[PDB]
Amino acid sequence: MTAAVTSSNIVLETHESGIKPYFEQKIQETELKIRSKTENVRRLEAQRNALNDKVRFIKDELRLLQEPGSYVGEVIKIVSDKKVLVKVQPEGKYIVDVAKDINVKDLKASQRVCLRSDSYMLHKVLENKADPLVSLMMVEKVPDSTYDMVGG
Amino acid sequence: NNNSALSNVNSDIYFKLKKLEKEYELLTLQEDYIKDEQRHLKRELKRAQEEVKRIQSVPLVIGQFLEPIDQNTGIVSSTTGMSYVVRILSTLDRELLKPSMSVALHRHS
Question: How does DSSP classify residue B44?
C-alpha cells in the first residue's frame, strides 16, 4: 500500500520511520560488535588448539618410548594350533600366540615379521626381507646390461 | 507490508537480540579465559620437553641405524647385537638419519 521508497500517508507511517532510528542504532551496533566477538573468541581458540596439538603429542608418545623390547623374527612355519614357530634372529626359537591383525593363513614360511614383546606377541609383517639368493648376487655385485654392451 | 507495521518488525528484532547477547556474553567470558590458557599450554610444553630430556641424557647405549620402516618407526641394531624396532623421536634429524649413521638409544626404555 505505502511505499518503501519513502513512506506514503504522512505522520502516521512517516511517523513510524520517524521513530525508527532509536530502535535501529541499538541493533545495528550490537550486530557488528557481537559478531566480531564471535570471530575473535574463535580466533583465540584456534591459536591454542594449535598449541594443544604440539604439547599433547609428547605425552602419549612417552608410552611408545618406554616399551619393553621389540625383536625381529621370521616364521619358520605356522601351526594350526593357532601358534607360530618364530625364530628370533639375535636369539632363538619360540612358539607363541598371534594377535588379531594377522593369522595363520596370512603367514607362510620365510616371511619376516615384527614383534611387540608382550611375550613375543606377533604384531605385523615386516616391510623388509633380504633374499638368500640376493646375498650371492649382492656380494658378487652385478648391474643390468643390454645389447649395446655386446653390439658390433 | 514493509512500511505498514514497521514498529512491529522492530520490536521483535529487539527482543530477540536482547536475549541472545546474554548468551554471547558467556562467549566473551570464554574469550578472556582462553588468553589465559595459551600461556598455560606454553609452560607445560617447556615442562613436557624437560621430561624427555631427562631421558635424552645418559645413561645410554649406542646403536647403528640400518633403515627406516616408516618415519616414526625405525630399525636399529644395538651393539649388543640385537635388533629392535624403535620409536623415532621427533625434533631430530631425518636426512642424515635415514642413511646409515650412529644413533643414540636409551638403555632402559
Answer: H
Write out chain B residues lying below 8 Å of A12, CB-based. Answer: none
Cell of A58: 609428547
Residue A92 CA to residue A97 CA, distance in Å, equals 16
User: DSSP state, A121?
Assistant: E
Residue A122 CA to residue A101 CA, distance in Å, equals: 9
What does the DSSP 8-state code read for residue A66?
S
CA distance A111 to B86: 20
* C-alpha cell at position A96: 607363541
Contact residues, chain A, for B17 at CB < 8 Å: 27, 30-31
Cβ burial B95-105 (10 Å sphere, 16+ → b, else e): eebeeeeebeb
Mutation test of the interface with chain A: which of B83, B105, B107, choosing the one with the most A Cβ atoms within 10 A? B83
Nominal resolution (angstroms): 7.0
Query: What does DSSP say about strands A73-79 and A111-116: parallel, antiparallel, or unpaired?
Result: antiparallel
B36 dihedral zone (left: phi>0; alpha: psi -120 to 50; beta): alpha
Sheet containing strand B82-87, edge to edge, reads B82-87, B73-78, B60-68, B102-106
Continuous H helices in A20-145: 20-65, 132-140
